[PDB]
Structure formats: structure tokens, C-alpha cells
């Protein structure tokens, strides 16, 4: 059931990275987008955000979201999560780091809830193009028409087709830890943490400790506060500094792997044939740019393939050998002459 995914649900931690277009400039958003994979057909997009969707801190849920503000995971009800493109999208499902959504064509993808007092959105430059499966360069999945073996991402989550790495988080910096006691700098730890003390003054440079204080140095701006939180693990993101140790294992299954489904494809209007002596006058009234392919059935193929968008009449020389033409997604047909 839903709770049979403890590897990603329990162990993972919402990390924060460097969104390129966080609102006005590049801030450090908790929803730093990574690995946009718009490689499907019908226009479904898989986005690997830096936030962890679905699971409340308290084991598991789905109506909740876990994002990291500060040193703590301030989890909330997911409520107004936007997934934007040239036009706003409509999300399908969300599972931990990944969120599957269906978008219209565009050149930018932006993600963001709006926690209410603050927005915390993020975008990234990445073109998204949607080629419908078939011979007709349509734009949106139509109400009716024939069906073809498309490829897309399943809405299902309980799959293990592919895995991704997840190791110990790196040494996250936090300047807010370098407080002072009016005589010397005081370090602090919230709970179970093991911070690192470093300062510019000639002193103990290593400073690995729980709650403690500097030896001699006094200038806050002349020190470093590195934080260690190895209790949880994070995704191997390219915008986060590597931990100096071992690549901790644990294969997080990819929630939405591609599958070979069946999408509804458009159906071009039927051509109006008009026979002529050894000549096939073909009246065409396309609705959207559709491929037209014809080939002679004789010894010489004599291929002809050309996209047609504006309604036009084309003619072909149908010899006694015969001719074949495939208009749109219609099944191929054949013809004679006298």
C-alpha cells in the first residue's frame, strides 16, 4: 500500500540548493528544481524538486508536504502548489522529490507552493515541446480519434524500474550559529547535532564539538559554523557540496518511470477523392498539419512525402502498376487504372 515505500519516505530529507531564478535573482530556495524530464509524448512532465512532497514528518501522508526552512523541516498541508509553463499547468501526482504534471508547450518551467506569508517559488530555463504521437502535428489530445502506442510516465508510484543514489549530506554552513557572549564567540547545537568550529585567529582549527565555545577568537566575521545532520540522507544533487566521507547507499526508487501506454491520437478529415484518367485528384481539408505519404506499387517506389497544412488539391499519376497513399492516421489504401 502507500506505506510500503519507507526507504524514500523515512530516510530522505528535503534539501535546499541554488535555484537560478528564485523570484528576482538566484536565491537558495527549498524547491530548487533539478532534472526536468519532458521526454514523453502527450505532454506529461516529471520534475525532481528539492522539496519532499507527500510525507508529513510523522511517518507518512499524501495531503502534506515537507520542505526545509532553516535547520528544521517545517512540514505543512500542500494547498496551492503551482506548476507553470507558458500557460499554467495541471499537476497529476506528487511523490517525495518528484512531482508529475501535465503542461502546455512553453520554454520555462516554474514550481511553487505559496505557504501564505511567503511564496518560496523557483523556475529554471528549459524548453518543453510536445510532439503528439502519430502523423498529425496536433497540439492537444483530442476528444476522439484513433489510438497509437505512445510512451509516457505512469501515474503509479509503486515501481522499481530504476533507482537513484542517496548518501550522507555534506557540511551545510549556517552563519546564525556564531553567536557571542560579549567576551568570546558561543557555538550552539539544536538537538543531537555535532557542529564544526573554525576561526581565522591562530587557534584550534578543527573544533568538532557539541555545545561549546571558542578558545581565543572573537570576530564572528572571522569564523565558520559548519553543521552536521547525518541522521537523515539527501539526494545526490549537483548543487550541494559533497560530504567528505563515504557514498552511503540506499536506492530510492524513481516514482514515475516511462511506460508504453496508449494515447488518443487525432483523426484527420477524410479526403474527397475525384478520379481522372490515370490520375488521382485528391481534395484535402486538413485541420492541423498532417503528414501525407504516397508510394508507387511498381518496380520503382517513387516516394513522395510532404507535410500539408493549408487545404490544397494534389494529384498523383496512378499507373496500371497501382499506387498507395496514407493520409494522416487513416489506414493505407490502394488504386488501379484502366
Amino acid at each position: 500500500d502507500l506505506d510500503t515505500h519507507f526507504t524514500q519516505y523515512k530516510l530522505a530529507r528535503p534539501y535546499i540548493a541554488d535555484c537560478p531564478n528564485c523570484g528576482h535573482s538566484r536565491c537558495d530556495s527549498p524547491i530548487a528544481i533539478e532534472e526536468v524530464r519532458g521526454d514523453a509524448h502527450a505532454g506529461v512532465i516529471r520534475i525532481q524538486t528539492s522539496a519532499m512532497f507527500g510525507l508529513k514528518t510523522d511517518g507518512v501522508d499524501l495531503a502534506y508536504m515537507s520542505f526545509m526552512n532553516g535547520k528544521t523541516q517545517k512540514s505543512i498541508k500542500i494547498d496551492n502548489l503551482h506548476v507553470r509553463t507558458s500557460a499554467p499547468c495541471s499537476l497529476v501526482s506528487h511523490h517525495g522529490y518528484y512531482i508529475l504534471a501535465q503542461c502546455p508547450p512553453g520554454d520555462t518551467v516554474t514550481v511553487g507552493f505559496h505557504d501564505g506569508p511567503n511564496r518560496h517559488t523557483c523556475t529554471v530555463a528549459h524548453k518543453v515541446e510536445f510532439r503528439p504521437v502519430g502523423r498529425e502535428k496536433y497540439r492537444h489530445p483530442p476528444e476522439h480519434g484513433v489510438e497509437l502506442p505512445c510512451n509516457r510516465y505512469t501515474h503509479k508510484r509503486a515501481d522499481q524500474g530504476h533507482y537513484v543514489e542517496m548518501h550522507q549530506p555534506g557540511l551545510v554552513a549556517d552563519h546564525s550559529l556564531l553567536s557571542i557572549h560579549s567576551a568570546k564567540v558561543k557555538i550552539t547545537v539544536p538537538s543531537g547535532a555535532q557542529v564544526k568550529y573554525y576561526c581565522k585567529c591562530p587557534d584550534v582549527r578543527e573544533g568538532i564539538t557539541s555545545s561549546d565555545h571558542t578558545t581565543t577568537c572573537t570576530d564572528v566575521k572571522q569564523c565558520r559554523a559548519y553543521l552536521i545532520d547525518n541522521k537523515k540522507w539527501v539526494y545526490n544533487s549537483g548543487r550541494l557540496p559533497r560530504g567528505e566521507g563515504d557514498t552511503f547507499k540506499g536506492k530510492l526508487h524513481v516514482p514515475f518511470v516511462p511506460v508504453k501506454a496508449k494515447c488518443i491520437a487525432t483523426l484527420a478529415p477524410e479526403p474527397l477523392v475525384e478520379h481522372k484518367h490515370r490520375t488521382l485528384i485528391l481534395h484535402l481539408h486538413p485541420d492541423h498539419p498532417t503528414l501525407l505519404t504516397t508510394r508507387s506499387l511498381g518496380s520503382d517506389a517513387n516516394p513522395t512525402r510532404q507535410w500539408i497544412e493549408r487545404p490544397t488539391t494534389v494529384n498523383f499519376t496512378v499507373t496500371g502498376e497501382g499506387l498507395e497513399y496514407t493520409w494522416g492516421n487513416h489506414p493505407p489504401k490502394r488504386v488501379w487504372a484502366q
Partner: antibody
Amino acid sequence: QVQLVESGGGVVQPGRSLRLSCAASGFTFSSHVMYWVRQAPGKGLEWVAVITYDGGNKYYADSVRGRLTISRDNSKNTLYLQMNSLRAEDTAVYYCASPRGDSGSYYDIDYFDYWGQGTLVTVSS
Amino acid sequence: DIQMTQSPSAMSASVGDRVTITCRASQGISNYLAWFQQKPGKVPKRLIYAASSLQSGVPSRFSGSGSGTEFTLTISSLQPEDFATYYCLQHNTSPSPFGQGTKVEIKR
């Protein structure tokens, strides 16, 4: 059974160098933090140095910093202490030790459970 | 650096006595501290860790208390095998200094 066996102790002249070794067995040596502790004749214990499972970090008491170098060879299950510029004050039994046999990258809270019998270093002319 | 101060440096006690050894850190070490017994000519043996976790296989007569800067080893009823030198160790930071050691001798 977990064993640690120190070797390479002996008599050395002041200003000379000596290399201690500690062979390990009965546990996964390459996964655990290793420590040197010394005890001068008739004195209390003195913490000398520590090295991580991978050797990537190394720490030293200020009394030995710049003169002693801790190292390891995980392929040989062997810990080393290179001692340079030895002084009469470095005359001690040197003990090889580890925490309880459970692992970590740059973390430990089981300091000093398993130890060797120690090797005597005498620094004298 | 951190320094560990033990009090007393030596004490005389009888079999059955309650022995209390105090260790003070020069800076806060939370509870990342341990206690070690050494008999003459032997290797040290750990008795307590985390300032109160009794080591597996060590007698229930040993107990530990304190946090932050002030810590203690309490032997509730001193046995003949307990006459030894006792060290505190802080393990919150590296370097990890031992205390000077407290020698428990037989009172006569």
C-alpha cells in the same frame, strides 16, 4: 576475538625517528576509527592522536603536533605512528585502541573499547 | 583546549565503602564522557559511557552522574578488585584528553 598488537617500540636517541605499527584482527579494520594513547612511566593516560576509517582526517595532541604523524593501511589492517624529532618526554608505553566495532565517517561516541597490550618507546642517548 | 580535572588525585577507602570520584571539564562537553579503570601493569578497561550508560558486562555497583561541565563516577560498595586508578575521558571533541586519574587505595 578482537585483537590489537603493537610493534616497533624500543630505545631511540633524542632527535631521531621511530615508526610504531599496530596489526588488527577479529573486526573490519577498514570501517573503524583508530586511536593512539600513551602512558609515561608512573604517569596518567595521555591521548596522542586519532585517524578516520579512510585516513582523510587526522588529529593530534598539541604536545605532539608537527612531530608525530598518524597513518593507516586498510589493505594490511595496520595502523602507524611515525614519530620524528623524539624527545625524552615522549618516553612512554604507546597503546593502539579503537571504539566499539561499529562504523561512521566523521562521528564517534563509543571512544576506546578495544586496545592492544602496548609497546614501550624509550627516548634516551 | 579542553582540560579534564579529577578530584581527588588519590583516596583511601575500605571494602564496602561508597566511593565518589568527580571530574570537571574546562568547557561544556554535554554528556559525551566515559570512565576507565586501570589496574597496575594492565591496559585500561571502560566502565561507563555517555556519562551514565554502564558498559555491558561491568558490575551494577558502578554508576555515573552529571552533565555540561561536572561529572561523577560512584562505586556503591567498593570490592577488593576495584582498587585501581580511575580516569575520566571527554569524547565530545578531538583532541580527547583524559583526566589526571584518581587512585583508589586500600585504607588500613
